[PDB]
Tab-separated table of C-alpha atoms in Angstrom:
chain	number	residue	atom	x	y	z
C	7	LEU	CA	2.548	12.186	75.964
C	8	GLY	CA	2.863	8.602	77.142
C	9	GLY	CA	3.960	7.149	80.537
C	10	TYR	CA	0.633	8.053	82.224
C	11	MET	CA	-2.634	6.320	83.180
C	12	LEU	CA	-6.262	7.525	83.249
C	13	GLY	CA	-8.299	7.361	86.477
C	14	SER	CA	-11.963	6.582	86.975
C	15	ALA	CA	-14.470	9.020	85.498
C	16	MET	CA	-16.280	11.701	87.506
C	17	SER	CA	-19.530	13.583	86.787
C	18	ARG	CA	-18.781	16.429	84.276
C	19	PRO	CA	-19.142	19.454	86.645
C	20	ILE	CA	-21.129	22.587	85.699
C	21	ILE	CA	-18.836	25.458	86.600
C	22	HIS	CA	-20.850	28.605	86.002
C	23	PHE	CA	-19.257	31.157	83.624
C	24	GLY	CA	-21.783	33.783	84.855
C	25	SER	CA	-24.220	33.354	81.926
C	26	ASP	CA	-26.806	30.540	81.491
C	27	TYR	CA	-25.945	30.202	77.781
C	28	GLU	CA	-22.321	29.161	78.424
C	29	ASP	CA	-23.721	26.739	81.036
C	30	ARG	CA	-26.290	25.141	78.685
C	31	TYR	CA	-24.082	25.288	75.538
C	32	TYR	CA	-21.534	23.143	77.359
C	33	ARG	CA	-24.257	21.081	79.081
C	34	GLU	CA	-26.115	19.708	76.069
C	35	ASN	CA	-22.689	19.144	74.393
C	36	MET	CA	-21.147	17.802	77.669
C	37	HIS	CA	-20.892	14.390	76.006
C	38	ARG	CA	-18.086	15.969	73.856
C	39	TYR	CA	-16.175	17.492	76.823
C	40	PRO	CA	-13.745	15.149	78.792
C	41	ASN	CA	-14.891	13.144	81.821
C	42	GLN	CA	-11.474	11.737	82.954
C	43	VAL	CA	-7.888	13.133	83.616
C	44	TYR	CA	-4.319	11.799	83.155
C	45	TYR	CA	-2.700	11.107	86.592
C	46	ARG	CA	-0.354	8.741	88.513
C	47	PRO	CA	-0.955	6.392	91.490
C	48	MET	CA	-0.276	8.838	94.421
C	49	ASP	CA	2.694	10.382	92.475
C	50	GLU	CA	5.985	11.083	94.379
C	51	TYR	CA	5.302	14.759	95.280
C	52	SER	CA	1.772	15.788	96.322
C	53	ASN	CA	0.273	19.306	95.914
C	54	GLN	CA	-2.793	21.451	96.563
C	55	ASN	CA	-2.969	23.183	93.155
C	56	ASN	CA	0.399	22.689	91.380
C	57	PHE	CA	-0.693	19.079	90.729
C	58	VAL	CA	-3.926	20.419	89.164
C	59	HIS	CA	-1.880	22.914	87.049
C	60	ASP	CA	-0.013	20.135	85.174
C	61	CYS	CA	-2.699	17.385	85.530
C	62	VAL	CA	-5.090	19.784	83.824
C	63	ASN	CA	-2.499	21.080	81.320
C	64	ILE	CA	-1.690	17.621	79.932
C	65	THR	CA	-5.362	16.482	79.875
C	66	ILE	CA	-6.539	19.816	78.302
C	67	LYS	CA	-3.715	19.753	75.742
C	68	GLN	CA	-4.444	16.111	74.872
C	69	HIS	CA	-7.900	17.256	73.793
C	70	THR	CA	-6.571	20.422	72.009
C	71	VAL	CA	-4.030	18.527	69.879
C	72	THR	CA	-6.118	15.550	68.784
C	73	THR	CA	-9.293	17.578	68.203
C	74	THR	CA	-7.366	19.765	65.682
C	75	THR	CA	-6.493	16.581	63.707
C	76	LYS	CA	-9.944	14.998	64.199
C	77	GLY	CA	-11.169	17.946	62.115
C	78	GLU	CA	-12.608	19.806	65.156
C	79	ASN	CA	-11.344	23.423	65.232
C	80	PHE	CA	-11.399	24.212	68.998
C	81	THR	CA	-11.057	27.891	69.928
C	82	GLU	CA	-10.155	29.628	73.213
C	83	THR	CA	-13.778	29.057	74.445
C	84	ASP	CA	-13.677	25.322	73.501
C	85	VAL	CA	-10.530	25.180	75.735
C	86	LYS	CA	-11.428	27.678	78.545
C	87	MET	CA	-14.762	25.933	79.163
C	88	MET	CA	-12.944	22.600	79.412
C	89	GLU	CA	-10.205	24.181	81.654
C	90	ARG	CA	-12.566	24.808	84.620
C	91	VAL	CA	-13.981	21.281	84.179
C	92	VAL	CA	-10.554	19.544	83.987
C	93	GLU	CA	-9.458	21.646	87.086
C	94	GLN	CA	-12.386	20.163	89.016
C	95	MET	CA	-11.670	16.656	87.654
C	96	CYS	CA	-7.981	16.927	88.751
C	97	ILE	CA	-9.072	18.233	92.219
C	98	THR	CA	-11.559	15.340	92.469
C	99	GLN	CA	-8.956	12.784	91.273
C	100	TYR	CA	-6.234	14.008	93.663
C	101	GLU	CA	-8.719	14.084	96.563
C	102	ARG	CA	-10.164	10.644	95.518
C	103	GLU	CA	-6.946	8.610	95.752
C	104	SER	CA	-5.020	10.780	98.246
C	105	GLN	CA	-8.000	10.445	100.674
C	106	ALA	CA	-7.424	6.663	100.811
C	107	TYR	CA	-3.728	7.023	101.705
C	108	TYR	CA	-5.108	7.842	105.192
C	109	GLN	CA	-7.409	4.712	105.193
C	110	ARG	CA	-4.846	1.931	104.447
């Protein structure tokens, strides 16, 4: 996992899991969860959600791998929480640079 750059940061979004505890558990700890995503400048092929799929996957996985070796045992919930958040971040990132392709 090289040959990629990291965009600006965006405000760690509070996707609701349907239970205030999951919301707050994340929230107080939201400093731990990622606030940026791996992307490219406009890429070469642009997509609604398939971009998000891989943009998320790589960013999610880059937590999941490292965290294991930084002595932080992350379970399905420490990933699935993050997943919704990284999905947002990749949506936001796509929409944030692709918007300005129509303003050049």
